[PDB]
């Protein structure tokens, strides 16, 4: 019954009918109902890889970046949660064309729609990893959500901050570009290792834990990483600088 | 049937006292309706037995707080619903974090 | 529930697992050199039946109730009681089909208690309820005598009278508990009054905004049905294969500057009506008006709930002033019994006050002789331990409590009464457990069960004698 719900909705978006009165339907259906989120999620990815209509998607993260929330509603927050964090994990490609849309509600004050969109930064960059779509065609709104993360390890209350370290653990696994970006990550671990919660503490211990077993410096020596003999193999520097100075600028940031 | 009564009776307090009428299965309840007649607190003579009448003024009071907690909910919903018509920095710096 | 097993693990002066076992059903009694233990006994059994004020127990915290604060290696204090059930009738509610029940209460560094039932973990309302209908409530009692407090039974407010005899009608815990639904009510009413003033000024305003916008907006649907009649009759008379001459011969020779401006006109009121309304309005409307009926008729049971349990607690107080009246003249006359048949030629009852009524707290007045004292101040030490100790025996006689805890109650009563007591208890006063910390010895000799106390090593340990 859901997937023929679904087909009727997207048939009634697609060919012939307002998308307005399905978009508002669906904003009605996020607004009181917080089951109704993965409906929503599973709706609009039905759209995108068969009918390839994308503009409702659009349309949906434009209006849920321009929305202002009672004081008292519990619950639009959770559904526009777990509808941004499913749709991160079900079309993050059409996801990302608003993104920085949706980035706006990280100055609202209810802590579940920055973990949400935290979250949504971490699994839209954690997907865009198999290569010959990703650095070409999107190259700055991925690097401005890479830094957006990096940003995010510094929020009041520790929960974005364990959600941002974990989007950024889930990150380091697949590395076909962005080496750059795992020093920094490294960095932010290590500064973050003395907080106040024991929760980020320990994720940012799981971060270095998953950054040290997958760290780039493979295929020479067998990747033992000993601080006696990579200072060695840059005090050989002498020997070889004074074509192949990357190897030096390797060895320095290995050491750092 | 009264065994439906005293079983529906007996769930609902079981209910009550391990602390699980949330804001949603507070309206599928009717043990103010048998709170109001007195025939389920009356046992073995006229006198009432105040252990369970106890009991059930818990349970009662247990179900009234959930239903003004949902109407809560619910107002909130629809002052967002309707609010919605009219269409700055979290980050602190590491000293308040160490 | 006759105690059968006591365990205690790391409480105040005992560091080790100390097992009592050997209680006999009808008479304990505790004894033992001073510094020993025994009154730790009793608040150790005090603290696995619950305590809110920890003055009672003699700690000002939790972890003070730990052996040596915790910090000598015992770092948990656990307590477990294990209740016989061969008799049923004196069994609380769902229990009936176990032998044997356990209750164990355990406190660790920094946090708080937690409670467990047969080695299954329950919270504190689960154990209190389970507590409360024996009647065996730590927190208003009328079976314990902590030491030095029997002597302080007739300093007592009438308040504080009038919840013993309370206790032993059964209507306690419906005090306590009516006088927390009125809280919780006024608290849950001033919220559903402010939720109310925000229903009346923020939401029917924007309705009728909305129906306003709906009346408008079939009046911008009428205009919608003369765009698509007429500029599709305009389009395709500009347009001059075949429908579009089907479609010129029911309307032939319609004027050309007349229809294009008349186009123009009804675009401009377009424009404005594009951005004054949405165009799904209707389903929007019919949203929030099933919002707010659903609301209201939310609020009417709501209204109608608060009216139903206020006038059924109006109702039950009535049943509650007559079993109190009903208790409280079986329990002054058998306190006047009691009392004459302990000292003589005395007498006592129990009064309500001065012009007011039972139900406000009740007097003890206390005659020796043919002379009635009008104020108890004036009695000894003795006198007023057997008045306490008689009141709490005319509460057995009314509805025997399982477990009558008794600190050194016999302190300031001579050798004569003394006796009495422990022959009192052993013969007359059967039906409870009764746990006695004494040094007199004519009260333990009259025992059925004893249990001597002994500090050794650092720790205490409980000897059967
Ligand atoms: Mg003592």
Redesign the interface.
């Known amino acids: 019954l859901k997937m023929f719900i679904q087909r009727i909705l997207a048939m009634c978006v697609k060919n012939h009918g307002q998308s307005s009165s399905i978009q508002s339907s669906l904003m009605?259906n996020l607004?009181?109902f917080l089951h109704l989120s993965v409906f929503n999620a599973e709706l609009l990815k039905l759209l995108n890889d068969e009918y390839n209509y994308p503009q409702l998607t659009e349309d949906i993260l434009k209006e849920i970046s321009?929305?202002?929330?009672?004081?008292?509603?519990?619950?639009?927050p959770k559904a526009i949660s777990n509808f941004l964090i499913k749709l991160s994990e079900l079309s993050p490609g059409i996801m990302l064309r608003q993104m920085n849309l949706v980035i706006t509600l990280?100055?609202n004050?209810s802590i579940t729609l920055?973990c949400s969109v935290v979250e949504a930064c971490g699994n839209i960059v954690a997907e865009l990893a198999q290569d010959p779509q990703t650095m070409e065609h999107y190259k700055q709104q991925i690097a401005v959500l890479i830094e957006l993360l990096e940003?995010?390890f510094?929020?009041?209350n520790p929960y974005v901050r364990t959600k941002a370290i974990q989007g950024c653990s889930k990150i380091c696994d697949l590395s076909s570009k962005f080496n750059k970006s795992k020093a920094k990550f490294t960095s932010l671990a290590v500064?973050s290792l003395?907080?106040?919660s024991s929760l980020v503490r320990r994720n940012s211990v799981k971060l270095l834990s998953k950054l040290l077993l997958k760290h780039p410096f493979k295929a020479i020596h067998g990747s033992q990483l000993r601080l006696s003999e990579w200072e060695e193999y840059l005090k050989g520097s002498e020997s070889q600088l004074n074509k192949l100075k990357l190897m030096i600028v390797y060895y320095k940031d290995a050491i750092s | 049937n009264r065994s439906t009564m005293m079983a529906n009776f007996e769930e609902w307090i079981k209910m009550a006292?391990?602390?699980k009428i949330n804001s949603r299965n507070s309206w599928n309840f009717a043990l103010?309706?048998y709170?109001?007649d007195?025939d389920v607190?009356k046992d073995g003579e006229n006198?009432?037995n105040?252990?369970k009448?106890?009991?059930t003024?818990?349970g009662?009071?247990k179900?009234?707080?959930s239903?003004?907690d949902?109407?809560?909910?619910?107002?909130?919903?629809?002052?967002?619903?309707?609010?919605?018509?009219?269409?700055?920095?979290?980050?602190?710096?590491?000293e308040?974090?160490? | 529930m006759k105690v059968e097993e006591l365990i205690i693990d790391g409480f105040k002066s005992y560091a080790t697992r100390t097992v009592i076992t050997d209680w006999d059903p009808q008479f304990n009694a505790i004894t033992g050199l001073n510094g020993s233990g025994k009154s730790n006994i009793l608040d150790a059994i005090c603290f696995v039946l619950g305590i809110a004020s920890m003055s009672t127990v003699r700690a000002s915290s939790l972890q003070d109730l730990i052996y040596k604060r915790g910090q000598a290696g015992v770092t948990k204090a656990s307590v477990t009681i294990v209740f016989d059930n061969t008799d049923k009738s004196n069994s609380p509610?769902g229990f009936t089909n176990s032998p044997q029940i356990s209750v164990t209460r355990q406190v660790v560094l920094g946090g708080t208690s937690k409670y467990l039932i047969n080695g299954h973990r329950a919270?504190q309302?689960?154990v209190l309820?389970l507590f409360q209908?024996v009647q065996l409530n730590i927190n208003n009692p009328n079976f314990l005598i902590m030491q030095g407090k029997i002597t302080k039974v007739l300093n007592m407010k009438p308040s504080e009278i009038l919840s013993l005899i309370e206790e032993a009608a059964?209507?306690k815990?419906?005090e306590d508990?009516?006088e927390?639904?009125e809280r919780?009510?006024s608290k849950?009413e001033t919220?559903?009054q402010e939720?109310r003033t925000?229903?009346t000024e923020?939401?029917e305003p924007?309705?009728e905004?909305?129906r306003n916008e709906k009346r408008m907006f079939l009046e911008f649907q009428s205009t919608q049905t003369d765009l698509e009649k007429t500029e599709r009759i305009v389009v395709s008379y500009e347009y001059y294969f075949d429908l579009v001459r089907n479609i010129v011969k029911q309307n032939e020779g319609i004027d050309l500057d007349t229809y294009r401006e008349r186009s123009k006109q009804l675009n401009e009121k377009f424009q404005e009506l594009r951005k004054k309304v949405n165009p799904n309005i209707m389903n929007m409307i019919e949203?929030?008006e099933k919002?707010?009926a659903?609301?209201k008729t939310?609020?009417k049971?709501?209204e109608k709930?608060?009216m139903?349990?206020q006038?059924?607690?109006s109702?039950?107080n009535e049943?509650?002033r007559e079993?109190l009246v009903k208790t409280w003249e079986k329990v002054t006359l058998d306190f006047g019994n009691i009392f004459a048949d302990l000292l003589p030629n005395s007498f006592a009852k129990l009064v309500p006050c001065e012009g007011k009524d039972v139900t406000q707290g009740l007097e003890v007045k206390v005659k020796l002789g043919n002379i009635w004292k009008e104020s108890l101040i004036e009695l000894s030490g003795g006198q007023r331990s057997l008045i306490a100790l008689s009141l709490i025996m005319a509460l057995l006689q009314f509805r025997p409590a399982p477990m009558y805890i008794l600190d050194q109650v016999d302190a300031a009563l001579d050798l004569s009464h003394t006796q009495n007591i422990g022959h009192l208890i052993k013969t007359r006063f059967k039906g409870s457990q009764f746990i006695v910390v004494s040094l007199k010895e004519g009260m333990f000799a009259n025992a059925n069960r004893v249990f001597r106390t002994r500090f050794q090593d650092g720790t205490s340990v409980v000897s059967i004698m």
């Open positions: 009605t607004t009181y321009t929305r202002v929330f009672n004081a008292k509603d519990t619950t639009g990280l100055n004050s920055r940003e995010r510094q929020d009041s500064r003395q907080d106040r | 006292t391990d602390n103010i309706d709170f109001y007195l607190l006198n009432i105040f252990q009448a106890s009991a003024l818990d009662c009071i179900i009234y707080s239903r003004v949902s109407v809560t909910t619910e107002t909130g919903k629809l002052l967002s619903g309707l609010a919605q018509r009219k269409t700055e920095t979290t980050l602190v710096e590491f308040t974090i160490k | 509610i919270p309302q689960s309820q209908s059964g209507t815990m419906f508990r009516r927390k639904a919780t009510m849950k919220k559903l939720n925000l229903l923020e939401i924007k309705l905004k909305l949203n929030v919002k707010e659903a609301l939310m609020i049971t709501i709930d608060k139903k349990i006038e059924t607690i109702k039950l049943y509650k079993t």
